[PDB]
């Protein structure tokens, strides 16, 4: 049906020419109606070029299916266009549609959103429309930042298409109706990731997102860890607060969050959350102690981020430095401590960070963590140990670091500087006893049966 393709495009050509030109007009529009049906089939087929013809005929219809100078276009026709392209399983059709016009044209964007409204009001298709919702990313700045229109920049000077608020309104409604419909777990987490960057900036009012977000934030777990981003976005923009923010943060940080994948974003948020200024010392002390105690079991790809942030916080809050260099003031206490060794006054698993006695503890955890196996990590603990020189450490060079980064680092190291080996290697490498060599057996061999 490539000849059918040629017939279709030539029919579009003669159609736009007769529209640019213009008891008979009834059949003259009968032609266009049946051609719309033809184009339904031809998009249900190449369907990308069929889609090109469809936007062309939408253009010609909007241009001259009226007596008025204004360009109304069939929202209904566009609606079934949207219906067929969203039911179609062709990712390439959807991509060409999104990139070519939705990421290009604002008339398309707005009327697209409302077409989505109508169509959703009347699962895999849910995934498709969700993909499209995610595919719209960029929020324009202003009504003069709209500044490009597929058809008919309106001379209304008050038009909904001229007012950014309406496009934000329509996309807002789209997201509202979609979450009102319901969505999957994976859809939920993808939203919760990309929201504050690309979904929360779409709302004329994000307060229902404040609702939904603090619900999944009070839910708990990795979803709530993702929810932190959104709730911070909202408390920053429109100061609708959570009740107990810092105590929530303190108990929120837990065992596995360092092992979570999104700790990078998490740490940038926490960098703000202690970049605040109205913070009491014992609160930031609590966060210090808890983070050291979790660093005792952390991955090193986290510890590399963990340490320089402490250098920062120590630089800002000198009433934390007492956990680094702590003198017994009194000889009486010196007697008491040399007699009875020290117990940690800090309370693990205490809820309120403003009451955990992190003050009067020490960073035994990190000074033991100096004796890590990994050398760069050990040096970074030495940075705490050594002296206070640099005014700050950025973390941006530290973030997003993984075992992958460490392995490619050692890989991209030189092929070989001439290395060293171990001399006088014993022969009884798998021998169980060797009672005649007097060298004690490999612990692995003693605890492993090889036979």
């Amino acid at each position: 049906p490539k000849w059918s393709l040629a017939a279709a495009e030539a029919l579009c050509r003669v159609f736009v020419r007769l529209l640019a030109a213009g008891t008979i007009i009834n059949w003259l529009r009968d032609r266009l109606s049946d051609y719309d049906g033809v184009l339904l089939s031809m998009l249900q087929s190449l369907a990308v070029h069929a889609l090109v013809l469809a936007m062309a005929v939408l253009k010609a219809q909007a241009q001259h299916l009226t007596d008025r100078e204004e360009a109304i276009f069939p929202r209904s026709f566009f609606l079934e266009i949207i219906a067929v392209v969203l039911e179609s399983p062709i990712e390439h059709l959807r991509g060409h549609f999104s990139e070519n016009f939705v990421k290009k044209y604002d008339d398309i964007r707005f009327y697209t959103f409302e077409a989505i409204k109508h169509f959703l009001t009347e699962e895999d298709v849910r995934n498709n429309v969700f993909n499209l919702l995610l595919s719209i990313e960029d929020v324009p700045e202003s009504n003069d930042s709209l500044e490009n229109f597929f058809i008919e920049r309106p001379p209304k000077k008050k038009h909904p298409l001229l007012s950014l608020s309406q496009h934000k309104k329509q996309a807002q409604e789209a997201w509202l109706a979609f979450m009102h419909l319901g969505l999957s777990k994976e859809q939920r987490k993808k939203v919760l990731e990309v929201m504050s960057a690309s979904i929360a900036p779409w709302f004329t009012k994000p307060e229902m997102l404040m609702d939904f977000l603090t619900d999944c934030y009070n839910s708990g777990g990795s979803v709530s860890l993702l929810a932190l981003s959104g709730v911070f976005y909202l408390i920053q923009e429109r100061n609708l607060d959570y009740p107990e923010f810092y105590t929530k943060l303190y108990s929120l940080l837990d065992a596995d969050i360092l092992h979570s994948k999104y700790r990078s974003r998490f740490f940038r948020l926490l960098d703000t959350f202690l970049a605040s200024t109205h913070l009491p010392a014992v609160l930031v002390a609590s966060f210090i102690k808890r983070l050291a105690r979790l660093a005792l079991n952390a991955p090193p790809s986290a510890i590399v981020v963990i340490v320089p942030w402490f250098y920062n916080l120590f630089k800002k809050h000198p009433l934390t430095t007492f956990m680094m260099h702590r003198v017994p003031r009194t000889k009486e206490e010196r007697e008491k401590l040399e007699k009875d060794g020290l117990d940690d006054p800090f309370l693990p698993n205490e809820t309120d960070p403003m009451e955990t006695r992190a003050i009067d503890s020490c960073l035994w955890e990190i000074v033991q963590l100096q004796s890590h196996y990994h050398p760069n990590v050990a040096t970074i603990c030495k940075i705490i140990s050594e002296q206070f020189t640099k005014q700050a450490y950025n973390l941006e060079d530290f973030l997003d670091h993984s075992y992958g980064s460490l392995l490619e680092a050692e890989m991209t190291k030189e092929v070989k500087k001439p290395p060293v080996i171990e001399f006088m290697i014993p022969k009884h490498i798998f021998t169980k006893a060797a009672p005649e060599e007097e060298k004690k057996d490999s612990l692995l061999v003693s605890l492993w049966d090889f036979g």
Partner: protein, 282 residues
């Protein structure tokens, strides 16, 4: 009868006019920050404290006068509140960052008295108005502890109260008997003749920032991070009036004009770098 009031915002202060409502003279001799800049009850002295720990005191006439009278460099750690004794011209309280509040005499080169007892940062304070409230000093820490000392016996506080929040502001009353503490979302009216907490009041979401005495010692405006200004009467403490500001606020004051100290105008200071003045004349 002045035409002056001070704003402290960043590495500088900007002495403003009440009449013209204009920043008359900026002073940018501050190194790092400037946590409180207040003028002596003359109208000729501005004192202010930087963030390295020095506190500077310098003279200003009406305008372009910044002669640095004295500097003190004792705390080695930022000072957040230096305030004049509203009677004596020569004494000022200074609550630092570290653990300390202390009274300075201007001619003296070492602080007159030092009061301790606080355990966290200390970041609000005031003197005690009233006649027999002679040398009586009140401070709120971040440590959920407000303390009042007498200067006569520099022991601990004579009185202390524990809240559940960081106490971010405080003010006494010109009756010299009762006192506002401001902490979290929760203000607290207290007795100081009986050391008995009268009543907690919470009509804000977020933490408050600042309280301001008003018209005739008869009302108090409060200012909170809720974008919210809310003024109460001092008899029942009901929410009497208030408004909203488009950015969460940090400082607040009404200020009076002249004869009998009718309130000339209020101004709020928001985190968004914006100093809003609402004025009324008569």
């Amino acid at each position: 009868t002045n035409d002056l009031f001070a704003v402290t915002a960043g590495p500088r202060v900007e002495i403003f006019s009440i009449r013209k409502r204009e920043p008359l003279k900026t002073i940018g001799r501050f190194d790092s920050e400037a946590h409180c800049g207040e003028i002596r009850p003359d109208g000729r002295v501005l004192v202010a404290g930087e963030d390295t720990g020095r506190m500077q005191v310098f003279d200003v006439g009406q305008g372009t006068r910044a002669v640095i009278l004295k500097t003190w460099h004792i705390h080695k750690q930022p000072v957040w509140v230096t305030k004049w004794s509203p009677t004596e011209l020569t004494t000022l309280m200074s609550c630092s960052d570290d653990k300390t509040v202390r009274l300075w005499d201007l001619p003296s080169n070492d602080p007159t008295r030092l009061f301790t007892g606080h355990t966290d940062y200390v970041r609000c304070g005031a003197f005690m108005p009233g006649s027999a409230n002679s040398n009586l000093l009140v401070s709120g820490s971040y440590d959920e502890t407000v303390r009042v000392w007498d200067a006569r016996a520099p022991g601990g506080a004579v009185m202390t109260f524990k809240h559940a929040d960081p106490i971010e502001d405080v003010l006494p009353l010109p009756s010299g008997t009762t006192l506002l503490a401001a902490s979290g979302n929760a203000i607290s009216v207290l007795d100081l003749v009986a050391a008995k907490p009268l009543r907690l009041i919470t009509n804000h979401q977020k933490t408050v920032t600042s309280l301001s005495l008003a018209s005739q010692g008869r009302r108090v405006v409060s200012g909170s991070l809720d974008g919210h200004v809310k003024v109460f009467e001092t008899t029942s403490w009901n929410v009497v009036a208030g408004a909203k500001y488009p950015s969460p606020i940090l400082s607040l004051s009404v200020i009076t004009a002249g004869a009998s100290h009718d309130d000339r105008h209020l101004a709020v200071g928001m985190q968004s770098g914006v100093l809003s003045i609402r004025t009324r004349l008569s």
